[PDB]
Design a protein around this ligand. Structure first.
Ligand code: NMM
Length: 304
């Protein structure tokens, strides 16, 4: 088993670098955020442009869906997050509190909470209904590159340019684990596995690692791509074969066999750094997006 991802659609419309793409949990939509200050919505299967959602005053670094596919949250250089009703286009809340660029965000599975990370070195936990900041965690000593909830929402993982991945108890705000690996290269991305047993972390030394975060043991290392500057998203692909998917600074999408760590496909087509990739929740579909010199989003499909 190798996959056979092939380009199906190219989605053009952002006028500056794309920052993040994400599929809706219900599989119907792709949301994209950009340095152009906009969120765009596209059909997940046909790439058909759906709408633009606007309101942020500066570029957006991340976007994320609620569990029911009705809301988005966005993280902006304007130091706010916004909560959006996707269908109406309304900004429901503006989450204020961070003192610098907000870089990363996610809903918990219940989607009553949002987690954010910022250049202000903090992680903040927010109440979705009221927009109030519930906790400010003194999480890191450099910008926070990623934040993610585990499968039951009881944990948060954060990554930072300080070289650390930390695991937090959602309820208490307590730091439960600090993951340490040698020379402490900036951690540019992190997320939990779908099952919540592992985390996948990217570091700016051209490396992805799969950690057992409780035991604190690096289980797999994925290499061959280029990642020394940008906070590039990585993924677990679980709809067919078990893959690791990542963007890369050589303009390619990389796909590794999770177990063997071998590169199984490289997807060519983008003309600038592939900053973001996402994997469709039920079909073997990858979305990718690129930086300023490209500005397009691509939808690729495989038989496995
Ligand atoms: C968690 N978000 C993220 N990795 N976004 C992509 C990078 C956005 C950044 N503002 C940049 O242009 O490099």
């Amino acid at each position: 088993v190798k996959p056979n991802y092939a380009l199906k659609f190219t989605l053009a419309g952002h006028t500056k670098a794309v920052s993040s793409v994400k599929f809706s949990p219900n599989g119907e939509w792709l949301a994209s955020s950009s340095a152009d200050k906009l969120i765009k919505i596209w059909g997940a299967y046909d790439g058909k442009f759906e709408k633009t959602i606007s309101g942020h005053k500066l570029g957006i670094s991340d976007v994320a869906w609620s569990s029911d596919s009705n809301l988005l949250v966005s993280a902006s250089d304007d130091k706010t997050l916004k909560i959006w009703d996707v269908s109406s286009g309304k900004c429901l809340k503006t989450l204020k509190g961070h003192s610098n660029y907000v870089f990363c965000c996610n809903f918990n599975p219940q989607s009553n909470l949002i987690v954010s990370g910022s250049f202000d070195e903090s992680v903040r936990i927010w109440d979705v209904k009221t927009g109030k900041c519930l906790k400010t965690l003194p999480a890191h000593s450099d910008p926070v590159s990623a934040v993610h909830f585990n499968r039951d929402g009881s944990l948060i993982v954060s990554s930072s340019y300080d070289g650390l991945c930390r695991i937090w108890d959602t309820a208490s705000g307590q730091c439960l684990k600090t993951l340490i690996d040698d020379d402490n290269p900036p951690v540019s991305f992190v997320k939990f596995s779908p099952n919540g047993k592992y985390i996948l972390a990217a570091t700016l030394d051209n490396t992805l690692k799969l950690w057992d975060y409780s035991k604190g043991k690096c289980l797999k290392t994925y290499t061959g791509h280029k990642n020394e500057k940008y906070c590039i998203f990585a993924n677990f692909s679980v709809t067919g074969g078990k893959w690791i998917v990542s963007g890369s600074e050589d303009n390619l999408v990389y796909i590794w066999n999770l177990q063997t760590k071998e590169i199984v496909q490289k997807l060519q087509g983008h003309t600038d750094v592939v900053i973001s990739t996402a994997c469709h929740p039920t079909e073997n579909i990858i979305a990718s997006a690129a930086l300023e010199n490209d500005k397009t989003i691509k939808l690729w499909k495989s038989d496995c």
